Coordinates of C-alpha atoms and ligand atoms in Angstrom, one line a residue:
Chain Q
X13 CA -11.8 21.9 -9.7
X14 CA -12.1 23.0 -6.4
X15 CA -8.4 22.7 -4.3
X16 CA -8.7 21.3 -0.8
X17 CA -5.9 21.8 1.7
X18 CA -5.4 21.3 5.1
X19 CA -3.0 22.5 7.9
X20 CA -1.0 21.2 10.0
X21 CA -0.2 17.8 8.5
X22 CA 0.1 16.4 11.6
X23 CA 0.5 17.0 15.0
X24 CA 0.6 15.7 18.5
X25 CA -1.1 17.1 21.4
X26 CA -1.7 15.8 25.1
X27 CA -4.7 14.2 26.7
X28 CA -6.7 17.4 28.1
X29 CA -5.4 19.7 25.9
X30 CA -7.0 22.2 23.4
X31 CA -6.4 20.9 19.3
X32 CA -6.9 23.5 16.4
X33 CA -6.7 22.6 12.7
X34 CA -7.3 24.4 9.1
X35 CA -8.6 23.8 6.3
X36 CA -8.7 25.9 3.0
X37 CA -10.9 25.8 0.3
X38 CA -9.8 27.5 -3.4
X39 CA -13.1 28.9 -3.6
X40 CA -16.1 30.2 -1.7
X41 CA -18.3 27.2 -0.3
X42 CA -20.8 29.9 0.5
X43 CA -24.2 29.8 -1.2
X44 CA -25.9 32.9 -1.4
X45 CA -29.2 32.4 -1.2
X46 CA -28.7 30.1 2.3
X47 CA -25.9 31.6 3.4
X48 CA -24.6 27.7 4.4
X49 CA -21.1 26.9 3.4
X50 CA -21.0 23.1 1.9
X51 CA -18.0 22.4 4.1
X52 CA -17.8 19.1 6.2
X53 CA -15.0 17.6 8.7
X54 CA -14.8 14.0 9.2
X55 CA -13.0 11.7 12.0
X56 CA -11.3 8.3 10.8
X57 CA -9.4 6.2 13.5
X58 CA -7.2 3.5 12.7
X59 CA -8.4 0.5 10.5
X60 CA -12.2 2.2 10.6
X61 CA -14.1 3.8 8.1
X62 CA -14.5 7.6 8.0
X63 CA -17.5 9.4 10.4
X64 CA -19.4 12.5 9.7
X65 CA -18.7 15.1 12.8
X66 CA -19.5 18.4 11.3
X67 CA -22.1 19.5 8.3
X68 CA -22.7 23.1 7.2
X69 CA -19.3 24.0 8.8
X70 CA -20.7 24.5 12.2
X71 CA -23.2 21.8 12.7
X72 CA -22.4 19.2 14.6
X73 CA -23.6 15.8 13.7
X74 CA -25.9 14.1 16.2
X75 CA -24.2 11.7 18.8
X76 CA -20.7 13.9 18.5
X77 CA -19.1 15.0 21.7
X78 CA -19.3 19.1 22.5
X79 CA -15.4 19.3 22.8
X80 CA -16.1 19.0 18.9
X81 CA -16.7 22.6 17.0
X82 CA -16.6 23.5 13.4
X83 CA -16.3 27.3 12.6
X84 CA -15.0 29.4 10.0
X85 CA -16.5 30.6 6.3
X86 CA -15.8 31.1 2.8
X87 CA -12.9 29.5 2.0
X88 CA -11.2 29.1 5.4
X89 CA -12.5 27.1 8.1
X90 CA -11.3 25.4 11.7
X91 CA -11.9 22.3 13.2
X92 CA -11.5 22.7 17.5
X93 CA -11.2 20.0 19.8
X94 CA -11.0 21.0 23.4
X95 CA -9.6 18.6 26.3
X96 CA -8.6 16.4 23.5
X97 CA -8.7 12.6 24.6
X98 CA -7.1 9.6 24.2
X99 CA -9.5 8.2 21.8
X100 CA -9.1 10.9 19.6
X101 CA -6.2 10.2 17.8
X102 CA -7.4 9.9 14.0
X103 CA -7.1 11.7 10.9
X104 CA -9.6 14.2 9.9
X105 CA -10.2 15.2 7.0
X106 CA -12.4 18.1 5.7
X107 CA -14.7 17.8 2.4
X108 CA -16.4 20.7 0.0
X109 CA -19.6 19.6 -1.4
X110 CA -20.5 22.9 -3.0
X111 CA -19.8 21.3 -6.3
X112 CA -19.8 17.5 -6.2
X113 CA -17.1 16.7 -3.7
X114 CA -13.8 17.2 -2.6
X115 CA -11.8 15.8 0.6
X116 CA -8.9 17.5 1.8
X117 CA -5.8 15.9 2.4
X118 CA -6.2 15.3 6.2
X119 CA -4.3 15.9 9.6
X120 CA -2.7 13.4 11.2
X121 CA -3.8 13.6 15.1
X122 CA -1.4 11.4 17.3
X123 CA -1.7 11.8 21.0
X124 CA 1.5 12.6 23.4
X125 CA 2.1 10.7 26.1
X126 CA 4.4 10.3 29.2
X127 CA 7.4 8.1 28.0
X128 CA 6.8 4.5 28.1
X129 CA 9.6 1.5 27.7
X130 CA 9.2 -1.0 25.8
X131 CA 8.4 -5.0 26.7
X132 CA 10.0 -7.2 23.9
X133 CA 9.4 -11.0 23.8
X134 CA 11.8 -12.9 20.9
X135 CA 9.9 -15.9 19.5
X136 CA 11.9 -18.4 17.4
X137 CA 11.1 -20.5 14.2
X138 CA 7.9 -22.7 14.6
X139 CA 8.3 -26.8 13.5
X140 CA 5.8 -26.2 11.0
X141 CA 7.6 -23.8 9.3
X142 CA 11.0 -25.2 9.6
X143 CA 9.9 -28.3 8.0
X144 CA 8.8 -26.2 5.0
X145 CA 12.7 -25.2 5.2
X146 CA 11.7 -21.7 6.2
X147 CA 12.9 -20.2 9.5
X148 CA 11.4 -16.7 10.7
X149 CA 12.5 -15.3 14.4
X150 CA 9.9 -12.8 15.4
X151 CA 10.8 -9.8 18.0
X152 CA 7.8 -7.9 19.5
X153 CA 8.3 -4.6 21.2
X154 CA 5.1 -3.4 22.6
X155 CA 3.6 -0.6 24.4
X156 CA 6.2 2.1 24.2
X157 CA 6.2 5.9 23.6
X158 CA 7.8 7.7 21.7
X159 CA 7.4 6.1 18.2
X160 CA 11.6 6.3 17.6
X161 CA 13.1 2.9 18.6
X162 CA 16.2 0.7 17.4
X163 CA 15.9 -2.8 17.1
X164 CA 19.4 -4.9 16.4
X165 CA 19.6 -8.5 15.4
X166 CA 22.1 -10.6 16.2
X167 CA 23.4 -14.3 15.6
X168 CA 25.5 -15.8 17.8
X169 CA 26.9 -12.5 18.8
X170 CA 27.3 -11.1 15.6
X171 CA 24.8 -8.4 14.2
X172 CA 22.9 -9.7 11.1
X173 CA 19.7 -8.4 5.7
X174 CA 16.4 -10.0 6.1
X175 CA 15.0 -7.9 8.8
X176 CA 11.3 -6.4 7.9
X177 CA 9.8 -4.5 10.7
X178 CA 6.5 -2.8 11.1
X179 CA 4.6 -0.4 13.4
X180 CA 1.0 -0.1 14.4
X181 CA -0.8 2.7 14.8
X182 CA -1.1 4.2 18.4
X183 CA -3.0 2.9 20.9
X184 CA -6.7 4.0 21.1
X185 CA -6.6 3.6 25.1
X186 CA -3.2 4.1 26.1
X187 CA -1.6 6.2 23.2
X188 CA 1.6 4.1 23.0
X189 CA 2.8 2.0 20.2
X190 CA 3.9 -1.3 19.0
X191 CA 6.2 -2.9 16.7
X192 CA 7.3 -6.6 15.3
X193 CA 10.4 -7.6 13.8
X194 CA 10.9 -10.2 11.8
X195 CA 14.2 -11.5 10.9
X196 CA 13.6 -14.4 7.7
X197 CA 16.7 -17.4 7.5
X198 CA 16.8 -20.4 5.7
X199 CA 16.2 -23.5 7.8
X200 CA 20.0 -24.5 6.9
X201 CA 21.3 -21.1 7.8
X202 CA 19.3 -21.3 11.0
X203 CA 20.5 -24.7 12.1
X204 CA 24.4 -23.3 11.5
X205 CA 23.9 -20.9 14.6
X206 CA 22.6 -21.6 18.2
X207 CA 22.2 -18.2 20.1
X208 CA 19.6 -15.5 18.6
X209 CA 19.1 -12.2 20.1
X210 CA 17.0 -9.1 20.2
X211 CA 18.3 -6.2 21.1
X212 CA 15.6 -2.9 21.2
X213 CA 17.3 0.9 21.8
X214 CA 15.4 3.3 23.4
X215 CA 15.5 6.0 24.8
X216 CA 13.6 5.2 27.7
X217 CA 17.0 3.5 29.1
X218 CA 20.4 4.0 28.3
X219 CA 21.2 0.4 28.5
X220 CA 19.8 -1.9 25.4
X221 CA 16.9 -4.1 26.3
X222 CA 18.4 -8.0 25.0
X223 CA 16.1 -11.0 24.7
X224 CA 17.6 -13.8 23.1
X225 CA 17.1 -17.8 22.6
X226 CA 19.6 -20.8 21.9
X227 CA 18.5 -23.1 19.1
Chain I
X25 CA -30.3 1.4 11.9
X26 CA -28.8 2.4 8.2
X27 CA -26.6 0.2 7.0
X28 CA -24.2 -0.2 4.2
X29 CA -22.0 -3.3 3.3
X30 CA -19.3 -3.0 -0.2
X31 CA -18.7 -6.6 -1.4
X32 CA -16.6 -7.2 -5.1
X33 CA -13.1 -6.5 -4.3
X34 CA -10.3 -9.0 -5.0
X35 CA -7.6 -9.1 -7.6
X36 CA -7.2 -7.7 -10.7
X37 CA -4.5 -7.4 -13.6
X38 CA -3.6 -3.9 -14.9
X39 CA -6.0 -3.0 -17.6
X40 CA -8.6 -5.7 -16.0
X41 CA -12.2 -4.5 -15.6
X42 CA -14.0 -5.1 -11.6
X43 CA -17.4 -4.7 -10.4
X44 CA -18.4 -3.6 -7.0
X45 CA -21.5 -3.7 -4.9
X46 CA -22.9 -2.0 -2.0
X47 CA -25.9 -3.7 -0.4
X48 CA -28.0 -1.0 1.5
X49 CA -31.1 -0.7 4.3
X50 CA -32.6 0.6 6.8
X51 CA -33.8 4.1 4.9
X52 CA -36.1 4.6 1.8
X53 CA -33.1 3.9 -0.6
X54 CA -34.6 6.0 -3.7
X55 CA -35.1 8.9 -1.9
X56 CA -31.0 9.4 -1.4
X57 CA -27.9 10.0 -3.9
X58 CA -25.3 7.7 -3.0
X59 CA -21.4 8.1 -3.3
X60 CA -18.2 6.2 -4.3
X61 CA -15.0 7.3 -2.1
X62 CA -11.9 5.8 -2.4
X63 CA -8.4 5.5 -0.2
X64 CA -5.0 4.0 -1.2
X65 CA -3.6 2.0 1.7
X66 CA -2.0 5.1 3.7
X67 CA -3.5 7.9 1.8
X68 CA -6.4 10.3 1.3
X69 CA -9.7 10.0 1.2
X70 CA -10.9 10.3 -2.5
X71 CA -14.7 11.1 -3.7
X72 CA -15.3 8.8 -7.1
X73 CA -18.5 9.2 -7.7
X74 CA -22.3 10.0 -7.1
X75 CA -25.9 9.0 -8.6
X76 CA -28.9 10.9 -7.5
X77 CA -32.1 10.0 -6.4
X78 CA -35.5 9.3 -7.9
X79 CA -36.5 13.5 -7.5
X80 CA -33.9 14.0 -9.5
X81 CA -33.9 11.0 -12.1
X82 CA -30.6 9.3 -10.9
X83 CA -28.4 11.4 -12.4
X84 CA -24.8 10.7 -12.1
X85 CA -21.7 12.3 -11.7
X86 CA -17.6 11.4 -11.4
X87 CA -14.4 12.9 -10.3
X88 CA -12.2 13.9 -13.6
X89 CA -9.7 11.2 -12.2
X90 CA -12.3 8.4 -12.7
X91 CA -14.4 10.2 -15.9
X92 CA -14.6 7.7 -18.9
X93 CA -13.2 4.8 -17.0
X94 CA -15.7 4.0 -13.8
X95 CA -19.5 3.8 -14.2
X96 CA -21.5 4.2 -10.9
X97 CA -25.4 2.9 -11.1
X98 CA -27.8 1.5 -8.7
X99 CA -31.0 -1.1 -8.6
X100 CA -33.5 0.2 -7.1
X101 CA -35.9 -2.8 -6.8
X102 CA -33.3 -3.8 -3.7
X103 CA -31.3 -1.0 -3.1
X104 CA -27.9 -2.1 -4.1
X105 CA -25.4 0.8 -5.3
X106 CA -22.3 -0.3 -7.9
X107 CA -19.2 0.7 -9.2
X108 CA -18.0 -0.4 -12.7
X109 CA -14.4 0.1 -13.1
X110 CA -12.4 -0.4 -16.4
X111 CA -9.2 -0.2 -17.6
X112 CA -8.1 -0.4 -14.4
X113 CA -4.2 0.9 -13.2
X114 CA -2.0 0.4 -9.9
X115 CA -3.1 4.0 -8.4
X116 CA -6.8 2.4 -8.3
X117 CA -5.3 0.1 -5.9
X118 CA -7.8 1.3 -2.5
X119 CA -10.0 0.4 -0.6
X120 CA -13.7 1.8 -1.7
X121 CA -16.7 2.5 0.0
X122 CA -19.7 3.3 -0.1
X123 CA -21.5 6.0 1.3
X124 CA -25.1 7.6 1.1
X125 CA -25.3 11.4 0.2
X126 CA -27.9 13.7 0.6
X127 CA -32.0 14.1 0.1
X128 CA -31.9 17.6 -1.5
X129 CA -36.0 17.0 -0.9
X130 CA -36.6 16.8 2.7
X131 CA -37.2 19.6 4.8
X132 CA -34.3 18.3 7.1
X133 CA -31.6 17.7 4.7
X134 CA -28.0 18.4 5.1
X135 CA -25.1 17.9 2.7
X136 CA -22.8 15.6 3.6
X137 CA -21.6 12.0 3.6
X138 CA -23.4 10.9 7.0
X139 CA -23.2 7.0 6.8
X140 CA -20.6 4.9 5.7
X141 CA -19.6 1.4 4.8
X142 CA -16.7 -0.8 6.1
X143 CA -15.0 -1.0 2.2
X144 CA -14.1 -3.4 0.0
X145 CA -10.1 -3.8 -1.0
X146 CA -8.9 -4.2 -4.4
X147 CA -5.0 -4.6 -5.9
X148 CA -4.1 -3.8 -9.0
X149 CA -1.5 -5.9 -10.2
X150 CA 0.2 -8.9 -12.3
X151 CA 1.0 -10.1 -9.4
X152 CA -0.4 -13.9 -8.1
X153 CA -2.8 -14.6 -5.7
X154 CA -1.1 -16.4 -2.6
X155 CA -2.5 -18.1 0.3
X156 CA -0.8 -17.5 3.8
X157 CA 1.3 -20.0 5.3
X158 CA 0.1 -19.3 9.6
X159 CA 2.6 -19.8 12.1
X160 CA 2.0 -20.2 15.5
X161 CA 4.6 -17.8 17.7
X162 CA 5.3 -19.5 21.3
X163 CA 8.0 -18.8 24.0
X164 CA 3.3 -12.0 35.4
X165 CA 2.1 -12.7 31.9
X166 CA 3.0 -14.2 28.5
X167 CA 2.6 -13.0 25.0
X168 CA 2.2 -15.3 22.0
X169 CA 1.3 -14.7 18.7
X170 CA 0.7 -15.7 14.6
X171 CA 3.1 -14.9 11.9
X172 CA 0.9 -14.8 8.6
X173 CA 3.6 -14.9 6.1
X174 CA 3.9 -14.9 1.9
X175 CA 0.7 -14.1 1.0
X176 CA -0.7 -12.0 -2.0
X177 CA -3.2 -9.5 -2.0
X178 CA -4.4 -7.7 0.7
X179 CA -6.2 -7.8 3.2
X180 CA -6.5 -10.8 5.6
X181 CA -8.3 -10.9 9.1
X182 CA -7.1 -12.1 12.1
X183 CA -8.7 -13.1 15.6
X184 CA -8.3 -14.7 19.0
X185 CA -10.0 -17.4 19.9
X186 CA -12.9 -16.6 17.8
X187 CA -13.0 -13.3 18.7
X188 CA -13.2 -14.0 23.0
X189 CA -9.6 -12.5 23.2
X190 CA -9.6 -8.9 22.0
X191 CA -8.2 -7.6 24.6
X192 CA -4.3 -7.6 24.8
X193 CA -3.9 -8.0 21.0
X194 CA -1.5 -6.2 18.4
X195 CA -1.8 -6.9 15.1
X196 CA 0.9 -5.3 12.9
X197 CA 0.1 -3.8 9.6
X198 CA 1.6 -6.2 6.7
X199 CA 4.9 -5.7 4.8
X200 CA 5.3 -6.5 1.3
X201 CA 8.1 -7.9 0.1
X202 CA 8.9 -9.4 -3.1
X203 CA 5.4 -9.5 -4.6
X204 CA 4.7 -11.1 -1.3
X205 CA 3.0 -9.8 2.1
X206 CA 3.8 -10.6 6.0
X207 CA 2.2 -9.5 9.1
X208 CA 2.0 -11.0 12.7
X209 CA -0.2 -10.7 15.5
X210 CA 0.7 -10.4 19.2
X211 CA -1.4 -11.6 22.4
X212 CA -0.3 -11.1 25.9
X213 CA -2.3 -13.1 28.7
X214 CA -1.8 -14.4 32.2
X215 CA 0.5 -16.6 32.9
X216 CA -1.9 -19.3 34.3
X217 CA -4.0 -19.7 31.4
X218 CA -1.4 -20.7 29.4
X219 CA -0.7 -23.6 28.2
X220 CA -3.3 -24.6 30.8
X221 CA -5.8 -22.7 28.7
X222 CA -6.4 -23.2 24.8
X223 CA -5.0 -20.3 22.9
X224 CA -6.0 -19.8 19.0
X225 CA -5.4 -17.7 16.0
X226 CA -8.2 -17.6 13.0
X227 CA -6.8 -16.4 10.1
X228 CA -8.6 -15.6 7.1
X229 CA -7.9 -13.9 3.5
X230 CA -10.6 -14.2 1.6
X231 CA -8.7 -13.8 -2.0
X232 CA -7.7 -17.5 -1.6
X233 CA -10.4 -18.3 0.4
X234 CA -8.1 -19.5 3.1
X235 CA -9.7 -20.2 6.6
X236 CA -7.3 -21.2 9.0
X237 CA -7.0 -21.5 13.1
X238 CA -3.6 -22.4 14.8
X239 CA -3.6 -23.1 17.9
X240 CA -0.7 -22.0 20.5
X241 CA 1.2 -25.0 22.1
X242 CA 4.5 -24.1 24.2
X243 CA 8.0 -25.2 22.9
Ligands
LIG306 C1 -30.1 28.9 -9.4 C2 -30.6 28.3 -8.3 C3 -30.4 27.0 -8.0 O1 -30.8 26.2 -6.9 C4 -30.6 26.3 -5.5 C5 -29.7 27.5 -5.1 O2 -30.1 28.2 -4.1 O3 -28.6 27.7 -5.7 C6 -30.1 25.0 -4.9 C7 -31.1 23.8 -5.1 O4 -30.2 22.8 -4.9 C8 -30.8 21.5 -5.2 C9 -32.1 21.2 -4.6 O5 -32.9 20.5 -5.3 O6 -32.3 21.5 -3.4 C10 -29.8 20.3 -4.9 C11 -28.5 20.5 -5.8 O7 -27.7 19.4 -5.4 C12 -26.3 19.2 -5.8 C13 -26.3 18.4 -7.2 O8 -27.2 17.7 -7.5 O9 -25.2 18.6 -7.9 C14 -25.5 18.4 -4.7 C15 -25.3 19.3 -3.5 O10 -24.4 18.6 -2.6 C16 -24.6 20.7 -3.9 O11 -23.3 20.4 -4.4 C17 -25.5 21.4 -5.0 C18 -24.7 22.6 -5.5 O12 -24.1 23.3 -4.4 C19 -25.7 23.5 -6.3 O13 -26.9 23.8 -5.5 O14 -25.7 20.5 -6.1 C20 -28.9 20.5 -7.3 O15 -29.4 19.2 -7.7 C21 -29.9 21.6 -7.6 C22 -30.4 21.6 -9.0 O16 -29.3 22.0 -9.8 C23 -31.6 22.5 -9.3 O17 -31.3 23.8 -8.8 O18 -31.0 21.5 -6.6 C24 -32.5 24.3 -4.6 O19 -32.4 24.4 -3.1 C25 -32.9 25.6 -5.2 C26 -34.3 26.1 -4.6 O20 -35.2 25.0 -4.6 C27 -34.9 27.2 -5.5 O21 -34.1 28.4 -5.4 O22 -31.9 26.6 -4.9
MG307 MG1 -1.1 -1.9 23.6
MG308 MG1 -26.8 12.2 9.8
ZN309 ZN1 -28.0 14.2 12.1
ZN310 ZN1 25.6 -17.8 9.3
ZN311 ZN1 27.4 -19.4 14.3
ZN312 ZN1 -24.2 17.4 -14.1

């Protein structure tokens, strides 16, 4: 039983900029006779498998960029990113080995960004899918910053249950972010209406971006 | 170059017993313990798991979450590492890799986790295993996309004409809903390749072994 805990949770910090995070151990990770503290950080970006960046607290792992730097002993210790870059955005986590292993729980590193509208493309049902009776219209709102954005359905002017949307994680390049909507009809409920529209809020303009189709 | 590929993960029913693999090379496999470390889709990292090396007569050891439940061993003759899990329950519902630990016995060891594999899914659940139906999405430049919709587990793969397009390309994490998951994939590319150029989706999840490619016509 060794606790692992890290600080902040998450955090956003812009391109350039100098990124400090903690993590605590319950217990000394300090052996004695080495003096090396079995304390490791390790980067995992989006959809990737975790990567060792820092061994023995303060070592940094072959191939790891110098804006990298473990410090700290005991039971508290830092992870330090200077001129923090785009493709940084990941979450790191921080691991005891001192007795078997323990990660902490991670921080969340998302990168800020100038703000960034939106461009939103409304697809509607394919034939192949209609013929199966199904009828999904798909909205796709992508490359924006920030993360908060509105999108409305509506049906031949009326707003419209059966909405699922989903974001992705920010962009590795160009820190913005993306999100689809989905809005799932019946073929026979899709056939009773003609006009279909998207409608995304942000607050990069005061006035609703609308893309829309007629059946 | 070290490298480490899981393999075993699929379906199971609560209570259900899995196996995995991890198929290793490119060091002395023996002279290494190895590690299990698991992560629930949108959580923490979780060490399983560990079995020593030969030095030490392949000793093992396991997080009190796993203890009594999961057996880690390995075969030496070809350096594969595995996982037996048992009685199995929804919160083991990750995805697990494998990674190799340390060499207490060379002059240059270090402790950590230093190489790591790509990790194999598994569900836990009563659920049923669903194929995909693939949909093709069609309307400076122009995006298009695939809606992968109703299908059960986790995960499936999508690319762009086999991989060529990369560039350009959002796919959004799925959604479950009603024992049943959705995700699209979105493509934006110049205006005069399309339609005048072929544009395809391959789709893949291997729990069904489903293997589809849709191409992208206008309408
Ligand atoms: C009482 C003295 C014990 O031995 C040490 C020491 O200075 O405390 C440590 C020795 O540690 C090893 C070794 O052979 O080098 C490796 C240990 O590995 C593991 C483990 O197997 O559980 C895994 C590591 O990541 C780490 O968690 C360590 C622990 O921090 C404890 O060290 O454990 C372990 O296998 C021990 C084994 O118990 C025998 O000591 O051995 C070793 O460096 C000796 C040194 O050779 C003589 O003083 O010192
Ligand atoms: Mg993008
Ligand atoms: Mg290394
Ligand atoms: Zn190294
Ligand atoms: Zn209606
Ligand atoms: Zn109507
Ligand atoms: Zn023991």
């Amino acid at each position: 039983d060794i606790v692992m805990t890290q600080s902040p949770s998450s955090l956003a910090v812009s391109a350039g900029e100098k990124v400090t995070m903690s993590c605590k151990s319950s217990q000394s990770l300090l052996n004695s006779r080495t003096r090396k503290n079995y304390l490791a950080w390790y980067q995992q970006k989006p959809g990737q498998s975790p990567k060792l960046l820092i061994y023995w607290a303060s070592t940094r792992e072959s191939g790891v960029p110098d804006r990298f730097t473990g410090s700290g002993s005991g039971t508290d210790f830092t992870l330090t990113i200077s001129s923090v870059q785009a493709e940084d955005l990941a979450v790191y986590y921080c691991k005891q080995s001192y007795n078997l292993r323990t990660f902490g729980g991670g921080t969340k590193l998302e990168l800020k960004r100038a703000d960034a509208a939106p461009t939103v493309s409304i697809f509607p049902p394919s034939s192949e899918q209609l013929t199966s009776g199904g009828a999904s219209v798909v909205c796709f709102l992508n490359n924006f910053y920030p993360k908060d954005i509105a999108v409305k359905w509506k049906i031949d002017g009326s707003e419209r249950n059966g909405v699922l949307n989903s974001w992705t994680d920010q962009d590795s390049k160009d820190s913005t972010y993306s999100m689809s909507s989905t809005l799932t009809l019946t073929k026979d409920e899709y056939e009773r209406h003609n006009s279909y529209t998207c409608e995304a809020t942000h607050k990069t303009s005061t006035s609703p971006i609308v893309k829309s189709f007629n059946r | 170059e070290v490298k480490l590929v899981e393999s075993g993960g699929g379906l199971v029913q609560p209570g259900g017993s899995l196996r995995l693999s991890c198929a290793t090379s490119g060091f002395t496999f023996t002279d290494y313990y190895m590690s299990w470390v698991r992560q629930p889709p949108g959580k923490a990292l979780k060490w399983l798991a560990f079995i020593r090396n030969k030095a030490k007569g392949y000793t093992t050891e396991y997080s009190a979450s796993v203890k009594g439940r999961f057996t880690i061993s390995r075969d030496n003759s070809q350096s594969f590492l595995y996982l037996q899990m048992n009685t199995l329950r929804a919160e083991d519902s990750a995805t697990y890799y494998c990674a190799r630990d340390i060499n207490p016995g060379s002059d240059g060891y270090y402790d950590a986790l230093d190489y790591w594999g790509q990790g194999t899914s598994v569900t836990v659940s009563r659920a049923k295993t669903t194929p995909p139906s693939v949909y093709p999405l069609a309307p400076s430049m122009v995006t298009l996309g695939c809606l992968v919709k109703g299908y059960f587990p986790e995960p499936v793969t999508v690319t762009w004409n086999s991989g060529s397009l990369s560039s350009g390309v959002h796919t959004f994490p799925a959604v479950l809903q009603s024992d049943l998951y959705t995700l699209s994939s979105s493509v934006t590319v110049p205006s005069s390749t399309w339609p005048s150029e072929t544009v395809t989706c391959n789709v893949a999840h291997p729990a069904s072994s489903t293997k589809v490619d849709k191409k992208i016509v206008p309408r």
